[PDB]
């Protein structure tokens, strides 16, 4: 019948909606992982810049000592 | 869509107010109309937050949990935790 065909195309659309989302999630994990890999390298440099800033001030204090 | 679809019936809101107060008290036509606008906004305010969250998850339907979540997001905890009780007795 015509109703039966309305189910086929509706499921073919449902199966495409799952195929898109599983690909979308797999891509979203790769994006997040790259963004997160940038943030962890950013802070490590900021820690090193602050750590280096201490060594300057700390070696200056020992100079008076 | 009609013009007054954005509001609720004045008589209904006015009836709820009458009950909230003692029998000797009276309410101003101005106040009735004010309350009407406030309670009508209360719905539209919450619904807008629930809707924008729905359009992130890509869900066309708006269910009770989206309303309860929208209320705790906008700082209506007492309302959200109170209507959890009404939804939980409905769902079963």
């Amino acid at each position: 019948t015509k109703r039966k065909a309305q189910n086929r195309a509706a499921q073919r659309a449902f199966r495409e909606r799952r195929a898109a989302r599983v690909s979308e999630l797999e891509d979203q994990i790769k994006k997040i992982e790259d963004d997160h890999e940038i943030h962890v390298a950013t802070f490590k440099e900021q820690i090193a810049n602050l750590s280096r800033e201490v060594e300057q001030c700390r070696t200056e204090m020992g100079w008076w000592r | 869509m009609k013009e007054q679809d954005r509001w609720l019936p004045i008589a209904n809101v006015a009836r709820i107010m009458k009950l909230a107060l003692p029998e000797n008290a009276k309410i101003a036509k101005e106040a009735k109309e004010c309350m009407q606008e406030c309670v009508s906004e209360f719905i539209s305010f919450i619904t807008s937050e629930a809707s924008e969250k729905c359009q992130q998850e890509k869900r066309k339907t708006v269910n009770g949990e989206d309303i309860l979540f929208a209320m705790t997001s906008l700082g209506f905890e007492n309302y959200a935790e109170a209507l959890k009780i009404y939804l939980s007795k409905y769902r079963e």
Partner: protein, 56 residues
Amino acid sequence: LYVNAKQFHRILKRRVARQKLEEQLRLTSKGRKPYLHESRHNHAMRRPRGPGGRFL
């Protein structure tokens, strides 16, 4: 004078929606009408009144 930071976002989102919908309604006037429906406004006058304005 500080407004709730939780609500703030939505108050702005609504302020837009209130304005756009009001322009679509073309009800630039904030004033409410004296009555709504003709037939009920007509019937309100039709009905038999009393000495104190009460309907019979």
